[PDB]
């Protein structure tokens, strides 16, 4: 049947409403990592151990 719902616009406006990545990361420890930018980064769901 295909995908009957799109959350792209909802998540777009949810990021927009929260002030964007800059404000959201201000709420976090991101600036405490001294990462020059938020672009070339990735997460890791589980640790090696």
């Amino acid at each position: 049947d295909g995908k009957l719902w799109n959350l792209n616009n909802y998540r777009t406006d949810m990021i927009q409403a929260l002030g964007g990545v800059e404000g959201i990361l201000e709420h976090t420890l991101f600036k405490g990592t001294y990462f020059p930018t938020w672009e070339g980064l990735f997460w890791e769901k589980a640790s090696g151990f």
Partner: protein
């Protein structure tokens, strides 16, 4: 205090506007390409074409009857002894990286790394240690002669 409202950095909006600008540029390029691409009797008569083919065949039968160097090297002048010659190769750089194509010798790199390690072992503007470390002698070529 009183702040100033900054522009919101929205990655979704960035991707969407990038796609929209790409689509607009593609449409403009398509229009410009069609501007050039849109400028291009015997077509139906078989006997006329046969006669023309025969006449072209007989017509063909009747007719038959170094100064290019201006780059730089990652070494000092005194690093090269006068009485010896060496081979200078390119330095491994990423293809997407757009730095200057420096020229390098492997043996001298090994020697420089060894002497750097020896100097570091022996050691053990303002605020030099955090500048010269966390923040490469070279000379440029001219017509193949330096």
């Amino acid at each position: 205090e009183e702040p100033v409202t900054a522009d919101v950095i929205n990655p979704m909006a960035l991707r969407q506007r990038e796609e929209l600008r790409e689509k607009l540029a593609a449409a403009k390029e398509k229009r410009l390409l069609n501007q050039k691409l849109g400028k291009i009797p015997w077509l139906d008569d078989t006997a006329a074409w046969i006669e023309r083919s025969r006449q072209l065949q007989k017509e063909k039968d009747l007719a038959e009857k170094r100064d290019l160097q201006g780059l730089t090297v990652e070494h000092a002048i005194d690093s090269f002894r006068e009485g010896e010659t060496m081979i200078l190769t390119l330095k491994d750089k990423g293809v997407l990286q757009e730095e200057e194509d420096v020229l390098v010798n492997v043996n001298l790199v090994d020697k420089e790394r060894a002497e750097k390690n020896v100097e570091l072992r022996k050691k053990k503007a303002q605020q030099k240690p955090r500048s010269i470390l966390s923040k490469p002698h070279s000379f440029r070529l001219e017509q193949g002669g330096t």
